[model samples]
Target: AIRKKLVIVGDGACGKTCLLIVFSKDQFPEVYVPTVFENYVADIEVDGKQVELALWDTAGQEDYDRLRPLSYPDTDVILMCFSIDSPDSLENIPEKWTPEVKHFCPNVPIILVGNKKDLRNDEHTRRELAKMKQEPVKPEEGRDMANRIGAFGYMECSAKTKDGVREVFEMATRAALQA
Candidate 1:
């Protein structure tokens, strides 16, 4: 009956707050302002195990990104998130953000999540963009990056529609239980 602390980190407008609200509160915001820092603690009994989950939803920008200093003491999980549609966010993952998180909290169970699967209405856009640009989208690229970082795994999700949200939590929880 122990507890697990999980942090969700991502770039600005990458849907980190929306994902947290969706899963933890079952609500979505139409007018999305970024979150500075938010925490939700839940106690659930899963398969006779009394488990507690602490979800830390962080601000995507730099000025309010004090989550590392605040929560590094006892973090059991970290969710590195990025928008699938934003190449800039994906590009920022290894180049800038993750190393700092790893350095401060290296051994926590981390899961890289590519948000916004519902925005993939552009089938031809993906093909045309890939063909014209000679590269796939950020989601595919982020998937590879997650593997290279030794993350549990990468998943594409949409908090707006709750697509893959449960699975994302379940996957991470199962991995945590296993670990």
Candidate 2:
């Protein structure tokens, strides 16, 4: 089987670890959340070849800014992410994430993932973000950002409901082959 490394980078608790958990374990995580996700193996087919995909999670906070680069080498694809509930996080992609990843892995394909979609579509969720003087991200804005950032793909997913979860990684698998 072919092997590849997939890394998820974004603001912490923006559903990066949760995305990994559901995809690797096929179940949503309960109450407790961890700072880092243990690498999990996903066996699947991409380009008609069985591929062993290794999922890696990054500490999205600035405290680990000095250490995050250690996971970059041999990276096959990047799942650069932002939360649907956090407006500033999405704003940071062009200002932050894009430059950072390009600095280390220039040719690796990047799939921008707007996670926490279980929160994305709910009217109940907007009340809090509204108080914060922000609002849930619009799907068109996500696609626009993807285009502006030149991403290989742009996907919005919900680890809570497992919506579009498989397609995100399926694209990532093919994106791995792209690099």
Candidate 3:
């Protein structure tokens, strides 16, 4: 019956765009194309009530930091995302994203999302991160970060496999409804 706005933010190449596109389009994209900014609207039913979910995808590059806040106004929920394969992106949660969203939309609910869940156990992903003296972020790490940052919820999903994708939006919409 109403339109709810959701703004997603995270580090570059952290799978934010792919997550949104997968959920919105039901298609998995093989090529990588960076998003400066993008918008999508999905007609979704949460709790049997119709809702127009407005998704605003923001660029995570430093070049766009000055412009990203322009999308924050009137947002009902914020999805602070990070890649499970990139520890730095998760570290940025409290350091960058939480502070930015709290500044712009102080009262909006934030759902911490760990993307690339499927890669957490992949041999190639594990091997790649091991070379850098790092490993995929664990589920407990995400939960702990969300708890520390006071996020509404913490979820892990993989856009490539379409796993846990729908639940992310459902939980987000539920949070938006409450907000």
Which one is best on lDDT? Answer: 3
* Higher-scoring candidate on lDDT, 1 or 2: 2
Clashes of 1: 0
Model 1, 113-170: lDDT tens digits are 9888776665754775565454334555877999887887888898878889877876
Runs in model 1 deviating more than 4 A are: 27-37, 44-48, 64-68, 122-139
TM-score winner: 3
Judged by lDDT relative to the true structure, which candidate is superior, 2 or 3? 3
Residue-level lDDT of model 2, residues 1-179, one tens digit each, is 98999988887656788889889867776776555677888998966878999998886544577788888888999999899988888998997889999988888889999998778768888988888788998899899999998899789998888889999998899989862
* lDDT (CA) per prediction: 0.73, 0.86, 0.88
Per-residue C-alpha lDDT of model 3 across residues 1-179, encoded as one tens digit per residue: 78999988888868888888888877676685445436888898999888899998886554576677888899999999999999989988897888889999988999999999998989998999999999999999999999999999899999899999999999899999993
lDDT of 1 at 172: 64
Instruction: Give stretches of model 2 more than 4 Å off.
Output: 30-35
Q: What is the lDDT of candidate 2?
A: 0.86
Q: Can you tell me which runs of candidate 3 are displaced by over 4 Å?
A: 30-37
